[PDB]
Swiss-Prot record, chains A, G:
It comes from Poliovirus type 3 (strains P3/Leon/37 and P3/Leon 12A[1]B). It comes from the Viruses. Interacts with capsid protein VP1 and capsid protein VP3. This is Capsid protein VP4. A lipid is attached at residue 1 (N-myristoyl glycine). Myristoylation is required during RNA encapsidation and formation of the mature virus particle.
């Protein structure tokens, strides 16, 4: 059940990809740590809720 | 955003001076840095982008 | 293998090749080996530079601060119910000197905290075991005015809760510099005086200093409400640089440090008396 | 082949050419030639200015005289060049500026003169001050421009507390910074030993914790020239020969244009 | 294992 | 397609951007865009300086006011830009300099105002003088810098012989130069007619009998702005609206670097 | 995710290559121990910064 | 494993 992922290495030792291992010990997922591997998304639903979304080089009002 | 009447017209200079010199007191000095000349008209709003110009990677 | 080069067997010479002569004016160190100037035997070399690698040189937890905090009846005059320390390697001299063989560095930092305590007075009853809160306050964040005010709520600042008697506390910090490397030396100013300034204090700055708060502070307190009897505690902070890289070598500090910059004051006489022709 | 040599060099940059018939080879600091900021090391997003030949050429500073009592001279970069033609204008019109340098130090004498100049290029050459007050040297004093500063044989603490001088007090055997001068050789350097060579030539890369920085707020390189062996001639007890420093910016680029910076050097 |  | 128009333009050069919502298209003088000197038209052999974004950007001159009595304004190039940032520094540090220009003239009012500005870009705009004395206008008077000069409705001969003014006397219907103004339209031009457009935009190529010349000794282009139809509003007999001129150097290159030229404008 | 390397054995017991095992428990590489497997380099950028690097048996100045 |  071990889960293996690559670390995003910031300061590299003078010694390439480094990994870390995770194992869940409990049946209830609420007990689990946070994966912190979070996908992002477009702001458009907030920055552009327009029915006709227009392109920035064209006149906003036409 | 210009919230004046439609019969009102005008041209405005909006600017950005990167650090290190005297903060602008005259249009003459402001012209010399990053700037947009905004013409008021049917498109009511103007956008000036302040480009990331820094020495450090994070301020 | 990481052993050093073997010594080559070298015999007599009568030639136009002269390794022994050179000109240091060029800026260069003469690349000579024993076999360039004396007859040598073959030696299979097994020695290595494993312990003098940059990581191995700094791979040791060094004492950078002694923070003192009291736990006692909150009276009404300047007390030590909580304490603050600006994070630095400059309050101590030993690690400071080691880091300063180099102009720039880049590394992750490991902090270990040894906490000791004792009874301040002859006797008023005793004290139940104490829990300590070590809170990091990054620049910009509200600093505490009182040992139990809202800032200790620590919702976003990282805090360590240490139980007295437990194994010394330990955390790791990423490389957190605003630049691509840490500057151990900065020949400059944070501000420039301009000809058009009102007072000439507007543009005044400390030589060599960069940001006002550098990296923030560690605020320390005893979470326990006070016992009747006073308990005094000291938190010793040990710092170790790990996953280390360094650039541009420098001469080591030869005279005693005098504050956070390169300033010297006295004991400017590092070298002993020895006669020119005395072994 | 043909007749070439380690001692005879011609350096050409822009409309300027230097010849030398008595060089001791030349140094490239840390093995790195000057270069422009690469896209994958770039931080300011605005299109840079690269003035090329108009700034990357040889500027000759005011000559200093070397005599039997001369304890040494120092300069900072870009500061020594702040008033140098179009380089200076570009430095003061932009918030950001990076540049490498070719440093050519000149000092000839005669086969009967004697003495040796230690020429050192130091990254981040922080100097020590005047006072009980730490890190208190003023900007105007820290930056002598083309004039440079000097070294002293000993530490005279600026005593006048009430109206302080806020100057550096660079002691020679301590390299003006709390270390021993004999170890300054770990820094990029050459020696002008008068029986061997007329000059020193050091090529400096931009060195910093950042790809580009404020040239007005921060000096990148310090140039320290100290007499390792004192000037001597015949029996004349008061000899004097000129030292001339010529410096060229290389691969100069500037970001963050706006109105001109006018620092207060009073 | 489940190596991602 | 999408919604584009002849009246709405964005001009971007260096760190500067101009927007306009009421343009009357834009003119490229003689159908030629600015360009650099080609190798087969090259004359000075020294490697040129091309300052690019630091000089080829929009400089806005001091605003002039247009009122019912305003007879007209004139400017010369490169002169109007001699003190403009790094362009000015490059102009005065080199013997030779060539450059093209984007000229943007700005004048808005209201749908109830009236009037028409004739905006003319003239190659070699030689102006007429003060006196009985021919070709006697002084350099300092010929070159007003950013201020520009004005036109007059009539010829007032500078009479004071003994201590002469040595100024131009540009009469408006004679285009300040002995010809009739109505024919000035053979020169590259636009009209700012207030019911139609806020502005004029003229792109100027370098024009000369040579590929490159002295910018300090010689102006290439003259900018003449004359009211073809007088400013009028409602019934208010003393109306006044601002005219603002913004100019950008383009494809600027300089040869013959040395110490800075400091002309005497007293 | 276990990582296995050879130890450089100093004093050998009277009993060949011996190994040690490493596993990273944390997502942030800053949390990791030091590998101490550090590669070295030439001193030349310091001991010989010369534009024309010359060979030791030839005259330094020519 | 990742045995080096
Ligand atoms: C002022 C001169 O010294 C330096 O330049 C210099 C450079 C780098 C240094 O590294 C420290 C930077 C990180 C600062 C802190 C970041 C977080 N820290 C924490 C955080 C949370 C806890 C609970 N305990 N410690 C402790 C350290 C320290 C000093
Ligand atoms: C998947 O996990 C198979 C590999 C298991 C390796 C040994 C795990 C040892 C830890 C056991 C966890 C027990 C938790 C209740
Ligand atoms: C790679 O690691 C796969 C093999 C895992 C062997 C069992 C590991 C037991 C330790 C689990 C570490 C959990 C750390 C959060």
């Amino acid at each position: 059940g071990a889960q293996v992922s690559s670390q995003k290495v910031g300061a590299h030792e003078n010694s390439s990809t480094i990994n870390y291992t995770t194992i869940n010990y409990y049946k209830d997922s609420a007990s689990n740590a946070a994966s912190k591997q979070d996908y992002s998304q477009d702001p458009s639903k907030f920055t552009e809720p327009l029915k006709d979304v227009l392109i920035k080089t064209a006149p906003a009002l036409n | 955003l210009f919230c004046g009447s439609m019969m009102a017209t005008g041209k405005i200079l909006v600017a950005y001076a990167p650090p290190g010199a005297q903060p602008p007191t005259s249009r003459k000095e402001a012209m010399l840095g990053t700037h947009v000349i905004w013409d008021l008209g049917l498109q009511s709003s103007c956008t000036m982008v302040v480009p990331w110009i820094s020495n450090v990677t994070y301020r | 293998q990481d052993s050093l080069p073997d010594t080559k067997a070298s015999g007599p010479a009568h030639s136009k090749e002269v390794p022994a002569l050179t000109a240091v004016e060029t800026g260069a160190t003469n690349p000579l080996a024993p076999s360039d100037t004396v007859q040598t035997r073959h030696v299979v070399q097994r020695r290595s530079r494993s312990e003098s690698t940059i990581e191995s040189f700094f791979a040791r937890g060094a004492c950078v601060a002694i923070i003192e905090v009291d736990n006692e009846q909150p009276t009404t005059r300047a007390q030590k119910l909580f304490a603050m320390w600006r994070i630095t390697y400059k309050d101590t001299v030993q690690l400071r000197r080691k880091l300063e063989f180099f102009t720039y560095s880049r590394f992750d930092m490991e902090f270990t905290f040894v906490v000791t305590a004792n009874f301040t007075n002859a006797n008023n009853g005793h004290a139940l075991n104490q829990v300590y809160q070590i809170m990091y306050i990054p620049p910009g964040a509200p600093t505490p005015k009182s040992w139990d005010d809202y800032t200790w709520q620590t919702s976003s600042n990282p805090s360590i809760f240490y139980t007295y008697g437990a194994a010394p506390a330990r955390i790791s910090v990423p490389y957190v510099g605003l630049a691509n490397a840490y500057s151990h030396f900065y020949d400059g100013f944070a501000k420039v005086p301009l000809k058009t300034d009102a007072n000439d204090q507007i543009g005044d700055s400390l030589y060599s200093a960069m940001t006002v708060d550098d990296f923030g502070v560690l605020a320390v307190r005893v979470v326990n409400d006070h016992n009747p009897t006073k308990v005094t505690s000291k938190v010793r902070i040990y710092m170790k640089p790990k996953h280390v890289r360094v650039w541009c070598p420098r001469p080591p500090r030869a005279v005693p440090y005098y504050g956070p910059g390169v300033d010297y004051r006295n004991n400017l006489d590092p070298l002993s008396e020895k006669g020119l022709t005395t072994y | 082949a043909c007749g070439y040599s380690d001692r005879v060099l011609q350096l050409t940059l822009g409309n300027s050419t230097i010849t030398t018939q008595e060089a001791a080879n030349s140094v490239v600091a840390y093995g790195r030639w000057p270069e422009f900021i690469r896209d994958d090391e770039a931080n300011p997003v605005d299109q840079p200015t690269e003035p090329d030949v108009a700034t990357c050429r040889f500027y000759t500073l005011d000559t200093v005289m070397w005599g039997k009592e001369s304890k040494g001279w120092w300069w900072k970069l870009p500061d020594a060049l702040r008033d140098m033609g179009l380089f200076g204008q570009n430095m003061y019109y932009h918030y950001l500026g990076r540049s490498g340098y070719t440093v050519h130090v000149q000092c000839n004498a005669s086969k009967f003169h004697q003495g040796a100049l230690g020429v050192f290029a130091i990254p981040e050459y922080c100097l020590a001050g005047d006072s009980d007050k730490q890190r208190y040297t003023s900007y105007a004093n820290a930056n002598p421009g083309e004039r440079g500063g000097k070294f002293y044989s000993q530490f005279n603490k600026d005593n006048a507390v009430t109206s302080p001088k806020r100057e550096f007090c660079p002691v020679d055997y301590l390299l003006g910074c709390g270390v021993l001068l004999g170890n300054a050789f770990v820094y990029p350097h050459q020696i002008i030993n008068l029986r061997t060579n007329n000059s020193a030539t050091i090529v400096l890369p931009y060195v910093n914790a950042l790809a580009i920085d404020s040239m007005v707020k921060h000096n990148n390189w310090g140039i320290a020239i100290l007499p390792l062996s004192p000037l001597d001639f015949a029996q004349d007890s008061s000899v004097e020969i000129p030292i001339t420093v010529t410096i060229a910016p290389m691969c100069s680029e500037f970001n963050g244009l706006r109105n001109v910076t006018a620092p207060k050097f009073q | 294992i489940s190596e991602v």
